[PDB]
């Protein structure tokens, strides 16, 4: 095929922003202050990119799974791509609903080649603002 | 046929296994720098070229600031994970 992805479809696609700021205190996770600026920054940035943005706020881990099952079971046939923006607490391969953890591979596998055939050969981006561990990069001087 | 795991791109805020920082007033370093570079270069740069300037931004323009000495003066480098098979431009033809 081409040297580049075909982006001249009717739509650019779906941009799903998942913004979890407040977490149940049974998790020990704290309020994520400043995430409202991020989610509102992303909505505008992709609004100029001609994306159909959908902000989704304080979703439980089960609400994250079932939304991505519904998004993946859509006719993306008229869309150039699928963007997904996750903003939450994190471990490696783990994203946090407001009540517990999700596996990053759970969410993404809904959109694979054999599962979301409306999005086969179509760029599926995933932006993950979340910790991947507890190691501190202290830096170095040049 | 194509594989089932191609054309996946994973932009990570921090390196694998590390802490990801966020400002309490402005927002996360990553989404901050990503929106700035997307708003600035989506007209002219390929996506992976936009995503590396996001890396230069978080790596150099940012540093942590905390009253806790344990979490102070810490850096962050993003992590691009591309299973993409072609280039990605947000402008057309």
């Amino acid at each position: 095929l081409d040297n580049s992805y075909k982006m001249d479809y009717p739509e650019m696609g779906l941009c799903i922003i998942i913004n979890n700021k407040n977490f149940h205190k049974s998790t020990g996770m704290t309020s994520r202050s400043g995430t409202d600026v991020d989610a509102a920054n992303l909505r505008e940035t992709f609004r100029n990119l001609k994306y159909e943005v959908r902000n989704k706020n304080d979703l439980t881990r089960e609400e994250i799974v079932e939304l991505m099952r519904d998004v993946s079971k859509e006719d993306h046939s008229k869309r150039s791509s699928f963007v997904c923006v996750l903003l939450s607490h994190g471990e490696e391969g783990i994203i946090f609903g407001t009540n517990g953890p999700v596996d990053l591979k759970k969410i993404t596998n809904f959109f694979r080649g054999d599962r979301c055939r409306s999005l086969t050969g179509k760029p599926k981006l995933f932006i993950i603002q979340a910790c991947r561990g507890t190691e501190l990069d202290c830096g170095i001087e040049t | 046929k194509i594989p089932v795991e191609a054309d996946f791109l994973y932009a990570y805020s921090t390196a694998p296994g590390y802490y990801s920082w966020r400002n309490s007033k402005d927002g996360s370093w990553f989404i901050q720098s990503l929106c700035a570079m997307l708003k600035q270069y989506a007209d002219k740069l390929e996506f992976m070229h936009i995503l590396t300037r996001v890396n230069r931004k978080v790596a150099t323009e940012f540093e942590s600031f905390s009253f806790d000495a344990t979490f102070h003066a810490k850096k962050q480098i993003p992590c691009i994970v591309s299973m993409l098979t072609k280039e990605l431009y947000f402008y057309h033809h």
């Binding site: - | 920082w21 400002n23 942590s64």
Partner: peptide, 5 residues
């Protein structure tokens, strides 16, 4: 101030 996720 800056916080870890």
């Amino acid at each position: 101030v800056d916080v870890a996720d």
